[PDB]
């Protein structure tokens, strides 16, 4: 697969310059806010390892993913994921803006039950108590993300 699924936003001109994968894909990231959310809200901790591997506590069971760059879409990654209930899926993401040490705003998109992909904007924080950073104010305005939903971390 050489480009993100049709229907997913490639965010051309909207992704940060100079993304440093080595500084992003290290340590833990808590998913604290998102544009769209479900109930009940939860606190997903994304654990990263070498070679774009990650683990997180998903809605029904732990999830393990293996990432790779998407050849045709700068900044995008494809993650092949499996869940402890026996599920498997492919999810795409790009880091829109991050300071690596505190926050990261991501775009995520993938097929999840239909030909029409579902997408979202996600705010990750290094601390479970993290909220909306001042540094993202202008970017959130530009993307019309002025009321992110708080999830289940504190
Ligand atoms: C450090 C940050 C790294 C970021 C890495 C980026 C992407 C890879 C990681 C996670 C991806 C999660 C995707 C979840 C799918 S849902 C994806 C999938 N579901 C299906 O594919 C179901 C298919 C069909 N609906 C069915 O019922 O069979 C599934 O089983 N998910 C389990 C679960 O969510 O716990 C939806 O809940 C997403 C909804 C919109 C969104 O928030 O993106």
**What CATH number did the domain enclosing 24 receive?**
2.40.128.20
The burial class, CB within 10 Å (0-12 / 13-18 / 19+), for 93 is buried
47 pocket-lining for ligand 1 (C-beta < 6 Å):
no
Assess whether the C-beta atom of 30 lies below 6 angstroms from ligand 1. Answer: no
Domain span at 93: 1-154
Among 88, 110, 89, 106, residue whose Cα is nearest residue 97: 106
- 33 forms beta bridges with 123, 150
SS (H, E, C) the chain: CCCCCCCCCCCCCCCCCCCCHHHHCCCEEEEEEECCCCCCCCCEEEEEECCCEEEEEECCEEEEEEEEECCCCCCEEEEEEEECCCCEEEEEEEEEEECCCCEEEEEEEECCCCCCCEEEEEEEECCCCCCCCHHHHHHHHHCCCCCCEECCCC
Pocket of ligand 1 contains residue 123 by CB under 6 Å: no
PDB resolution in Å? 1.3
Dist. CA 11–CA 30, nearest whole Å? 23
Q: Phi, psi (5° rounding) for residue 64?
A: -120, 130
Give the chain's domain count.
1
Rounded CA gap, 44 and 94, in Å?
18
For ligand 1, atom 27: residue with the closest CA = 113
């Amino acid at each position: 697969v050489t480009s993100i699924p049709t229907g997913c936003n490639a965010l051309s001109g909207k992704i940060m310059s100079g993304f440093d994968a080595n500084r992003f894909f290290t340590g833990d990231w808590y998913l604290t806010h998102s544009r769209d959310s479900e109930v009940p809200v939860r606190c997903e901790k994304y654990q990263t390892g070498s070679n774009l591997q990650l683990n997180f506590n998903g809605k029904n069971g732990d999830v393990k993913c293996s990432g790779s760059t998407v050849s045709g879409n700068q900044g995008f990654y494809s993650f092949q994921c499996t869940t402890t209930s026996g599920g498997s899926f492919t999810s795409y993401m790009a880091v829109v803006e991050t300071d690596y040490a505190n926050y990261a705003l991501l775009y995520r998109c993938g097929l999840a039950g239909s030909t029409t992909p579902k997408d979202n904007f996600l705010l990750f924080n290094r601390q479970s108590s993290g909220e909306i950073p001042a540094g993202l104010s202008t970017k959130l305005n530009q993307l019309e993300l002025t009321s992110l939903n708080k999830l289940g971390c504190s």
